[PDB]
Amino acid sequence: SIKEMPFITCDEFNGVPSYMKSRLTYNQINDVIKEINKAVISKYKILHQPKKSMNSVTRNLYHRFIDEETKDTKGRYFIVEADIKEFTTLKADKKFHVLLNILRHCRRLSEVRGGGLTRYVIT
């Protein structure tokens, strides 16, 4: 029952301010949403995995996921930049943070900081 980010619609996309849209095409934003969802699912499948079934690489990820929990993330779904790198071939560059800003505007994610870490909380 892992939480996924819904695709942006025609109406929604036409309604985000022009300067944000910039270079970014409509399929571009939705393609990125697919990849972010892939990372969310990958992370949370590991979290829900029986610990005795974990190999060394999975346990190391599991440990990092636990290190990144806070009281503000309890019962919520989030990823960080390392997850994008771990589970996707998405480049976390300038265009990517521009993309993230459209996602925040369309209320698909928000940010939980602290511990010097930016967490992207789904929804």
Author numbering: 2 to 124
Describing publication, verbatim:
Models from crystal form I (space group C2221) and II (space group P32) were refined to 2.1 and 2.3 Å with R factors of 19.6 and 22.5, and Rfree factors of 25.1 and 26.8, respectively, and superpose well with an overall root mean square deviation of 0.6 Å. Residues 133–142 are stabilized in an extended conformation, followed by eight α-helical segments (α1–α8) and a C-terminal β-hairpin. The structural analysis showed that the Ska1–MTBD is related to a winged-helix domain, a domain known for its ability to bind DNA and in mediating protein–protein interactions. Analysis of the electrostatic surface potential revealed the existence of contiguous positively charged patches all over the Ska1–MTBD surface, suggesting the potential involvement of multiple MT contact sites. Although mutations at K170/177 and K135/203/206 showed no major effects on MT binding, mutations at R155/236/245, a region reported recently to be critical for MT binding, together with two new regions identified in this study, K183/184/203/206 and K217/223/226/227, all showed significant reductions in MT binding (Kd=20±4.5, 17.1±5.5 and 14.5±2.8 μM, respectively, versus WT=2.9±0.6 μM), pointing to the existence of multiple MT interaction sites. These results provide clear evidence that the human Ska complex binds MTs through a multipartite binding mode of Ska1–MTBD. Remarkably, the tubulin contact sites are dispersed across the surface of the Ska1–MTBD and distances between different contact sites range between 15 and 30 Å.
The ternary Ska complex, composed of Ska1, Ska2 and Ska3, localizes to the outer KT in a KMN-dependent manner. Although GST–Ska1133–255 is not strictly equivalent to the FL Ska1 dimer in the native complex, and thus might bind MTs differently, it clearly interacted with MTs more efficiently than Ska1133–255.
